[PDB]
Amino acid sequence: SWGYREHNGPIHWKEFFPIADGDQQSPIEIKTKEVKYDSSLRPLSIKYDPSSAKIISNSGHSFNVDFDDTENKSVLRGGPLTGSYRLRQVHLHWGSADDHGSEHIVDGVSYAAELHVVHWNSDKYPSFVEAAHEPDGLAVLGVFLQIGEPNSQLQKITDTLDSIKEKGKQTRFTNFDLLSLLPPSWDYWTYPGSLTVPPLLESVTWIVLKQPINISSQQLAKFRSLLCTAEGEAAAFLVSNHRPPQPLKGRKVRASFH
């Protein structure tokens, strides 16, 4: 089964998921000299209902906070998007060191970690599973994290981690103020790409926010204490879960700002 260890990590994924070498894979290096400003891009419009959050689980690959997705209470519109994209879940990527944990990189620079907020096109498709197999199906908001003052919604997450240490565990999680994990500037970059985990489907419109938010070193370290293994298996720790940047293959990265 896939993971981030030496014999099941990113370089091996193509052995089971051939789309790993596809032409629209993520993450990428954003090269600001090649980024094109586009005045047709719209500002992001976001609304996340804190009571939309239901549970947090350990997938063995990250934590996932899952949201009720039967209504348009928590939705993302505008940006590069056509129509309404319904919030499905949030999760985080990090690395074994505090200065090299993000998925996307900007002009050579890695951030400490990278938060992804996953949405699906509910104006066109009947569920997230269906949306995940279409080019305009999903939209993921990426927010970088840098070492700084602790965020209280990140503490709300890290307080749960002891209860979800083993893969498959979950616990109630609601009244989650997700909008608190967005930076005050919503300037962004956007490009067409993929899930960064197997099955690596090329269905994602990426929207990567330029400004980072802050996490403490203590908060960040608590994520590395999650296991990628299940209860009563030999313990292995999720000390890193970021995929390297993938070939751009000519894709256009657009900026909302200049």
Evaluate whether 203 touches 194 at the Cβ level (below 8 Å): yes
**Residue 61 makes contact with ligand WWX by CB under 6 A:** yes
**Residue 88 makes contact with Zn ion by CB under 5 A:** no
Tell me whether residue 197 is annotated as binding: yes
Map residues 41-60 to x or -, x wherever contact with ligand WWX holds by CB under 6 A: ------------------x-
**Residue 61 makes contact with Zn ion by CB under 5 A:** no
**Residue 190 makes contact with ligand WWX by CB under 6 A:** no
Tell me whether residue 196 is annotated as binding: yes
Encode 195-246 in three state secondary structure: CCCCCCCCCEEEEEECCCEEECHHHHHHHCCCECCCCCCCCCECCCCCCCCC
Tell me whether residue 106 is annotated as binding: no
Part of the chain binding Zn ion (CB under 5 A), chosen from 82-90, 104-112, 116-124, 236-244:
116-124
Q: How far is the CB of 26 from Zn ion (least distance, A)?
A: 9
When the beta carbons of 104 and 210 are compared against ligand WWX, the nearer one is 104
DSSP 8-state code for residue 125: -
Tokens of residue 180, six digits: 């608190």
**Residue 119 makes contact with ligand WWX by CB under 6 A:** no
Using CB under 6 A, which of 9, 78, 199, 245 touches ligand WWX? 199
β-pairing verdict for 36-37 and 254-255: parallel
Q: How many residues bind ligand WWX (CB under 6 A)?
A: 16
When the beta carbons of 37 and 129 are compared against ligand WWX, the nearer one is 129
Using CB under 6 A, which of 115, 140, 181, 209 touches ligand WWX? 140
Peptide bond preceding 10 in cis form (omega within 30 of 0) = no
Report the C-alpha gap between 252 and 239 in whole angstroms: 32
Evaluate whether 201 touches 41 at the Cβ level (below 8 Å): no
Tell me whether residue 93 is annotated as binding: yes
Helix H or strand E encompassing 78? strand 75-78
Query: 133 an active-site residue?
Result: no
Query: What are the Cα distances from residue 247, in Å, to 29, 102, 187?
Result: 9, 17, 24
When the beta carbons of 37 and 130 are compared against ligand WWX, the nearer one is 130
Active site residues: 61
Residues that bind Zn ion (CB under 5 A): 116
